[PDB]
Structures are given as C-alpha cells and as structure tokens.
C-alpha cells in the first residue's frame, strides 16, 4: 500500500478536538428547519439588551426581594446627600448579578467594553428636583460630597423635565490576574464607581408622595468583547 | 387622540406612541406549499379579527403583577372562542394594548412584556419535595387571568429583573398610560392546539409600586383590549 | 477585536460527560451486564442552565465512548454499543432480540480500540427541540412535557453469550455541533427541583445576587 | 514516510457505516442484468396501490376469513342507520393491518400524508339506494346520527348511479410521541373518523337479492411519505 | 418534502447478523475446530419477509466478521476464513486439500485485528436471485427449488495444525449493497413453516390483522 | 477503506519533530500582537553590537 508514519497525538480523544465523526443514521433526513422569530445567533446579541440592576441589592427578606430592583429618593434627603452607589463590575458580586449581562459575564474569564446604565424616575408626574450623578473613574476615590463629585465627570439629572436620563461607562477591562486564595481569579481593579447625590431636595406639591422610586437598567455597548468560556454555575441539574 | 373601529368594535386611544414589534416580525399568513394545502385553512377576517376588550383588572399598591396564557384568554371569549374549540389547528398573531387611566398624581411603573411557552412552575410544597403540577386554573386562567404570587421568579424561577429580554415595553404613569405590543405566530410548528398549548403568556407587572396621597382613587383601572392578526384555523369539528 | 468566542456554536461546542455506566460482576447495580441509557443532555450539571436561555435550539450531536475498569484499567473485552432510535424498542434482558434488529445501529469496538465515535442528528420530529411547554400532550400530571424531544437510547453490553469476565464502566461525551437557537428568556436563578419542571423552593426564594448593608456603602 | 493521527472512533465496526470493502473475487464478471418487467424503486410505490381494506375485519372463524374482506347492506336498514366506521389509522391494528399500505407502515418509525379510500357497490345491478359517507376529522367526535354526520364533510353516494365512489382523506400523521407501558411508541392520535350511514333504505325490486356486499380498497396519495426504518414482524424465519 | 428513507437500497442496507459459529473446545457441537456455512441470507429473522416482497432481486454483499470467546473476549489466535464459491468443494476435514487451493479465496486476520471485511458479488448464472419457482429442476420433492441462487460457503477455522486453545465464536454480519428487484407479491401473512416452502399451518390460518367485535364499535 | 502500510518511525516522539499537534483551544482567538519596539530576528544581529572586553581580567 501506501507509505505511512504515525505521529503522536494518535488516538487521544481531545473533549475540544472538533473533527467529525461517523454517522449514526446515514439515510436519515431530519425533519426541515422552518422559520422561528428570534434567532440569536451571538451571545453578545443579549449584552446590549437593557436587564433591571439590583442597585438596591440590600433586602433580602424574601417577600421584600422585589424592592432590590427599585431604589427611593424622597422629600426628606437634603441638598448634597449621597442618594446611592455602586461600581462598574459587571461580574463580581452584588448589583450586576441581577442583570443579564452580568449572568453572561459567568461563563467568561476576561472582557472589556463600554457600559450603558439607564435611569428611571417613576415618581407621581407632579415632581421636579435635581439629581447629580458622577462617575470617578478606576483609581479615582468616592467623592467625598456634592460638590467634589461636580468637579468630576458627572450629570445633573432634573427628572422634572425628562424622565429618563442614561450615562455611559466609556470602559471597563476585567484582565487583571490575581493568584490570592490558591484559586486564581481574573479580577477587575478597574472598579469605576458611579454615585448619585441630591443636587435639590424633592420638591412636590400638596397631593402627591413624597416618595418615588427609581428604577436603573443596564447593558454592555457594542465595543463590547469576551474570551475564554468557563462554565461556572451554583445551579446545576440535581440528582 | 383618535378613535379606530375594527367591525363593531370601537375604542378610543392615543394617535401612536411607540409600539413594540415582538422580534421585528409581523403575524403574516402561512404560504400555499405548507403540510396541508389539501385541507385549505380559512382565515377568519369578518368579525373574527376585531377588539375585544377584557374585564379591567384594578391596580392597588399591594398588587404583585398579572399574567394571561394565550391563546387561552379568547379560546372562551367570543366568535374566535367558537373558532379556537371546534377547529384542530390554528396559527395567530396578536395587537395586543394595554392601558391605565390614572391622574398625575398616583405614581407608579408597569412592565409589559410577552414570554413564549410561559410554563408555570409552582412553589412545590415549600420545602422542595413535593412534585405539584400547577392547577388548570394557573396553566390557562382564562381571560380574567392570574396574580403572580412569586414576581421576583415570575413563578417560574426565573429572575424578573432579566424579562426584558422578551418583548415588552414601559408604562411609567408620569409618561404614558397606553404601552402597545405586536406579536408573531411563534412555535416550533407551522399549526398547533389552540387548546392544549399556549404559545405564549401576556406578563404585566408592577415594578415600582403603586403610590398616592389619601384621597386620590386607590386603584388603577388597567384596560387590556387585544385583537387577532392574520389568524388562520384549519379542520372544523 | 474578534468576537467568534460568543457565537452559540463556539459556547456550545466541547464535548462534555452527560452519562457513565457501571457494569459491576458482583451487584445490584446492572446485574444482567448489560444497560439502557435514554440520551439526556442534562447530564453535564451545567448544561441545564445554559441551554434553559432558550426556548428553542437544533443541533446534531458527536458522542465519544470511554470505556475502562474502576481502576481506569484497560482489558481485552469487545462490546457493543446500540442505539434504540425514539420508536424502536430497548432491550429488556441480555438476550433480547433487541440486541440483533439492524435498523438499531450498532457499533463494535474492542477496549483496547480507541474510543468509537459517531455523529446522531437531529433526531426531532418538530422543527426544534424546544425546552418549555405551555400545555399539555392531547391540575394534570403531563403539563410542561414537550414529547418530540426524544433523541433515542444507548444500550450498551458487553458482548457474548455468558457475563463478561472483568468490571466495566462507560463513559459517553457528547459534543454539540451545529447549534442555533431561537426566543431568549432569563436565566434561571432557582435551584433545580426536577428534571421535567420549573418547580423551585417556594420556601428557599433567595435574591439573584449577593447582598449589601446600604444601598450607599461599597 | 506520510505523517498522521488516528482519530477516535479508529477500527470500530458500525453496521451502519456503508463504506466500501475489498472485492473476494476481483476476477469474476457477474452475469449481466437484463430486462425485467415491473422492476420497483421506491417502496412509495407500492403505498399507492390499492389493496382491500378488512373493514368488516371482525369474523375470525377460520372458513369466514375471506368476509373481512366485505362489508354488506339491506334491505333492512332504516334510513340513518349507521352502515359502518373505522378510523384514518394505517399503522395502528385493525382494518388497515390487511391492506399493503398498512404492512410497509410497520418497517417505518412515522409517516404522513393524504389517504384515498375507494367504494364498490357489488350488488345486483337492479338495486338503488344513497349512503352517506362521513368524515369526522381528528379531534371530532363520531356523529350521533345521518343528520349531524351530513353537516360535516359528507358525501351522499347512489349506488343506483355510480358503482365506485372514492373519498380521499385529507390528512394523517403519526409523529406525536407517547411513552406509555416503558415502550416508547411514536403513534397517531389524528385518528380520522371514516362513518357510513343509511341516507335512504335499499330499494330492490321483485327478483333481486336484499343483499349486497361492498368492497373497500385504500391506498395513500403520492404526498405520502415514510422515516425512519423499524424492522418488526411477527413472522420470522423459523429455525 | 424528501422520500430517500423509501427506496430499496436505503430499505435492504445495514448489517445484519446472518450467521453465529461455535467453535468450542469440549463440544458435540464443531468437535473438528472448524466450521462450513453455506450463505444463507435469511439468518437474519426479520430479511425472510421483507425480501419475499419480490420475486426478484439483485445485489452484493458486504461481510463483516466479528470473532471473540463466549465472554466476548478477545485472544491471540489466528484465523482463515475461507470463501468456497458455489461449485467448489467445501472442507470435510481439518485438513481437507480445499483449505489450500488458491481458487477458494481466503482472508487470514487475528482476532486482535478489527473485524475483517468483504465484499462478495452477484453469484448467481441467472440475471437474478428469485425468491420464487413455479416448476422442478430437470408430486415431486424438488418443487419450488430455484437452485442457482446459490452465493456459496464460508469455512472457518483456527489456523495451524493442532487444536485451538480458546473457544470461539465467529460472527458474521451483512450489509446489502446495490440492490433492485422487479415484481412485488402479497406481504406474508401465514407463519412460515420451512425454509423451502410457502408451506403454512393450514390449522392455524390467521386473520392478516387485529380484529373488533362490530363494524360498527371502534 | 484506502490502503495504507504504517512504515518504520511510526509511533516515535521525535523531541526535534517540528510537525503540528491538535490546539488544545479552538476557539481561543490570542490577545493580537501590537507594535514593540528593538524586535530582534536572528541572534547574529546581537553578534555585531559592541560589549566592553575584559582584556584585564585578572582583578577577581
């Protein structure tokens, strides 16, 4: 016959080796793929869709789970008080978590892009005020108040002439190693951080709450990337 | 404003916020070269495809969110409820509209979306050892529809703060009071059940709670009229 | 620049364990040396949660077989893999003319023979594999059972007429090519109850995420 | 020499891999194939012919076999009686099991496809009457009587004008799953109802038999279709 | 839309098993260690039927020989297989001159080897394998016999001059390649009695299928 | 299937064998590699860079 050398490498079973294989049934003609609506067709399809942030991930009681989605500002929060905060890590813990892009994020070891947080106030129509939310970049400390956060890149948002406002995280890059515990995890440290003061106090005339709430949405911009599939999960198929 | 008459049927609505197109496709017909071009399917158009406005479920701070299972709501309802019973196939598309009627000052932020084979998943026992199939009252809950009694997991275990990854759409009470959707035949088969399977389920919940000062009325009328598009039956019984 | 990592294909792909057999000599465990295993793809833990994002999929699948003793020893014993297509009927004893039927594919390889490898596809009548269902099959105990999904079964044995001589355990991987899918839905962030439903722990309801003190204190 | 890697899957033996083998006699010129008449190739073929449907498949005594074979009508029958009713069910047992059509069924897993059921009146040629031949699609009910049967897919035949009639049954598939017993078994449910009536009585004059037998043959249209084969008999070599 | 599941050659294709040979060490059964199996294509059960569809066919077979120890384990032993085309003298011996000659094609392979494969052709003189004979070969016990339908006789062995030291036993499968046929016939509905004949059990004569109470109940 | 003869060397582990193995990551698309500058090529480009000659070396 034919002259031939077997190199190693010969008959290993790689789990990634993709090459084909016989088939099973070779007169089978599978049932036709007719035309379904919806077809994803990349992941990253699903990072750019706007998924409610638990920014008040902080109730945990279990019929008050429905208030992690939603934080209040109200009457009583004077001039420059520091409504909330939290940072851009889309993976790591807290906030995210509860976002889709987050949950993507889990089987995926390392990625960077721009991000895209959307506020909504859901208050009575009748208010008006002002609210200031700055973003200190990776490095960059809290702000210690109001008026060092203006200084910085921030956005008086008056929810009396516009119900929505949304700010963009021009980047986050989770590419930084670290070999802490003995587990070596792919962590950030570029923890932006975006915090939110009261510009004014809540101004609302007789007849209408001195409460609302607001509701924050977030996604992943198009410039967004990842690598490196790492099936990760808490929730498996049991027993 | 401007009102639209389709048939007998006449509502008054706003001149076209933003509708929702679910995935960008319009409930088309189904062409000539499918699995029964003997049996011709008729495509009820005379009053089969008109408004038909459902029993106004009333908003209230404690309400934890509504769900209808499609298309269960109408299968009892009217001359598409005679049409989705003695008929052995059927394909539908849906402009379904929901609205509040609520004054500028009672606060509030619904979430209306649409979610594919809705199969709800019971609180099993509590503990988790009790494998309890959902009632028929819970699976297709007619067209007066079901209170979620797990929003966060839409009593499915699914995270809520993740829906919008279905098509849905906004009613913040100090923006808008009528949210619009337009749904395509969605399933893994050309015809199905209209009985058996509920290709989809009709969510509406409260996201931000209902709020007002004493005095102002308690509860938000929260009017859903839908309608048929591009319906199509086959195999009458 | 490349986003090829994110395709379903790419998430997809990799052939992971979904099945292991033990063909113990003393036990109570497949005492007749043979068995039946109805292809579930749920058998890699994670998989459940990923493919769960969809409501539908398609896709054909490469299994790969590993065979060895406990001791992940190799031994000169022949075996037969089968495959009972959805409809065809499993073997019921170790001599069931189930074993001999050609239209149930059957595979021969030695131990000692590399692992043996074959492509199934797209077995479905439907158009897709679809994970959920909002009905049931024309308070019932058949809600959520989506029929059309059945993907056959592997029966495997060892071959010859008497017990074979050592102990024996398959493995069966399975790599997923061609993978496209349909309509998104979120993630499950509930423990999993049941293999058939979306049952939780309606006692359990925990937040999707780790917690905090105040909503202003990182 | 040439460098390779042999892939798993490497010197198994698939009694479904249909590759090609080394020839024992490389010599040997077979004799060649000449002309034969009626050569098949697609079993389809066969589907659509018509072969005799055992309605009347209920005597069982040896010598009255050959009665399954056809079904009679009299003088007898009041108007609206109901004549006969069998069911659009070529795979599953019954009437179906005698025609071939039903028989090459049982080598295959599912099927779909327009049926063809044809009439014979073989009665004296002297005799009139009307039937009224019903089709209850699947899901619908066996109606109560000639009334409601003749406000569904009906037609009325004169076996005083035409002596065949041949209705086609639009559809039937066996695809829908059922795991019953442990025996997973892909079978209808589309269970068609076929309903014969009495639309007037049979009217015979001096002379003439008061009965008649009718034929039943059936055959599949040519938008039939098979998958997947399932070898199954009953009837094998014996030893 | 696609009918190729239908067609012959995708009907009569796969391996069948056809033939089971024992070659055990202390026996009544092969005391010789050899064996002599004129091709029989009906040793798969369920082929009987489903070829007396026709009365005429055409085709090649490909053979498989799979060979182990009733544990179906796998031992050190040569083999030779031999192929004794119709005409040719099959072995009477474990040392019949018919091992030898060269015209007896024969196919040496260890059971360690994967199986060994082949293809035969179209034997028959006639333009093709008939199931059915209405005459006699130039009441008469030779009625029916289409004798050139003969495909000829496989001789198996251990190699070597003494006895083998393991039990043996040899398979050997078929795939049918290349097949047509001309004039289809009734479907078997009777019992079959004997290899030759369409003899059935006329006590026994069954109604083709299930049967019902009325014509009327179903 | 095609006929072959395995011929002398097959199975042997070459440690100087530069054929190509299986990627152990197929769908790993590597960190792209971006502008450095002094990229050496071939070692003799260092062979003709000046280096301080110890001629005294005797001081230890």
């Not at chain 1, 889309?90 to 987050?102: A, C, D, E, I, V």
């Not at chain 1, 948002?157 to 890059?173: M, Y």
């Not at chain 1, 001195?210 to 924050?216: G, L, P």
């Not at chain 2, 009985?195 to 709670?209: E, Q």
Request: proline share 8%.
């Amino acid at each position: 016959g034919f002259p031939t050398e077997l190199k190693p490498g010969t008959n290993q079973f790689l789990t990634t080796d993709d090459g084909v294989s016989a088939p099973i049934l070779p007169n089978f003609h599978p049932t036709p793929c007719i035309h379904i609506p919806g077809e994803v067709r990349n992941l990253l399809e699903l990072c750019q869709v706007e998924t409610i942030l638990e920014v008040n991930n902080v109730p945990t009681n279990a019929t008050s789970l429905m208030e992690r989605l939603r934080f209040p500002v109200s009457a009583q929060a004077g001039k420059g008080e520091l409504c909330a905060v939290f940072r851009a890590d889309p993976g790591r813990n807290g906030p995210w978590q509860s976002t889709l892009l987050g949950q993507l994020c889990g089987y995926y070891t390392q990625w960077s892009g721009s991000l895209e947080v959307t506020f909504m106030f859901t208050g009575s129509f009748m208010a008006t005020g002002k609210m200031l939310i700055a973003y200190t970049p990776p490095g960059g400390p809290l702000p210690k108040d109001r008026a060092t956060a203006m200084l910085g890149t921030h956005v008086i948002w008056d929810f009396g002439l516009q119900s929505s406002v949304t700010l963009v995280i021009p980047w986050i890059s989770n590419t930084h190693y670290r070999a802490h515990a003995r587990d070596g995890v792919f962590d950030y440290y570029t923890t932006g951080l975006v915090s939110i003061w009261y510009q004014t106090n809540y101004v609302v005339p007789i007849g209408a709450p001195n409460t609302a709430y607001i509701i924050a949405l977030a996604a992943a911009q198009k410039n967004f990337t990842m690598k490196l599939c790492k099936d990760a999960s808490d929730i498996l198929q049991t027993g | 404003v401007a009102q639209l008459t389709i048939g007998n049927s006449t509502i008054t609505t706003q001149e076209a916020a933003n509708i929702i197109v679910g995935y960008g496709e319009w409930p088309s017909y189904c062409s000539d070269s499918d699995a029964t071009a003997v049996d011709k399917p008729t495509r009820p158009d005379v009053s089969v495809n008109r408004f038909y406005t459902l029993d106004t479920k009333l908003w209230e701070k404690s309400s934890k969110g509504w769900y209808w299972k499609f298309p269960d709501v109408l299968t009892e309802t009217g001359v598409f409820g005679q049409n989705a019973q003695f008929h052995y196939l059927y394909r539908s598309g849906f402009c379904i509209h929901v609205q509040c009627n609520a004054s500028k000052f009672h606060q509030g932020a619904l979430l209306v979306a649409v979610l594919p084979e809705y199969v709800i998943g019971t609180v099993a026992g509590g503990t988790g050892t009790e494998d309890t199939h959902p009632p028929y009252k819970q699976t297709q809950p007619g067209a007066d529809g079901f209170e979620l009694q797990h929003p966060y997991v839409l009593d499915a275990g699914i995270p809520i703060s993740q829906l919008t990854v279905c098509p849905h759409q906004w009613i913040n009470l100090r923006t808008n009071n009528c949210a619009t959707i337009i749904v395509p035949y969605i399933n893994a088969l050309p015809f199905d059940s209209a009985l058996n399977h509920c290709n989809f389920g009709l969510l509406v919940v409260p996201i931000s709670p209902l709020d007002y000062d004493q005095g102002a009325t308690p509860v938000i009328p929260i009017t859903i009229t839908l309608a048929p598009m591009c319906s199509e039956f086959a195999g009458l019984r | 620049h490349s986003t090829a990592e994110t395709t379903l294909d790419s998430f997809f792909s990799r052939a992971g364990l979904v099945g292991e057999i033990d063909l113990p000599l003393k036990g109570t465990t497949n005492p007749n040396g043979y068995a039946n295993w109805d292809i579930d793809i749920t058998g890699y833990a994670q998989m459940r949660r990923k493919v769960e994002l969809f409501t539908y999929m398609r896709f054909d699948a490469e299994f790969t077989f590993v065979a060895c003793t406990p001791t992940g020893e190799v031994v000169p014993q022949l075996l037969q893999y089968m495959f009972v297509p959805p409809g065809a009927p499993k073997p019921d004893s170790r001599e069931s003319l189930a074993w001999q039927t050609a239209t149930n594919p059957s595979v021969f390889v030695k131990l000692s023979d590399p692992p043996a490898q074959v492509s199934v596809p797209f077995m479905s009548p439907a158009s897709a594999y679809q994970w959920f269902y909002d009905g049931y099959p024309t308070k019932d105990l058949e809600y959520g059972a989506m029929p059309n999904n059945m993907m056959g079964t592997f029966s495997v044995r060892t071959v010859g007429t008497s017990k074979s001589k050592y102990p024996l355990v398959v493995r069966i991987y399975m790599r997923m090519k061609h993978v496209r899918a349909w309509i998104p839905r979120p993630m499950r962030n509930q423990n999993y109850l049941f293999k058939a439903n979306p049952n939780y722990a309606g006692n359990s309801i925990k937040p999707t995420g780790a917690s905090r003190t105040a909503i202003t204190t990182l």
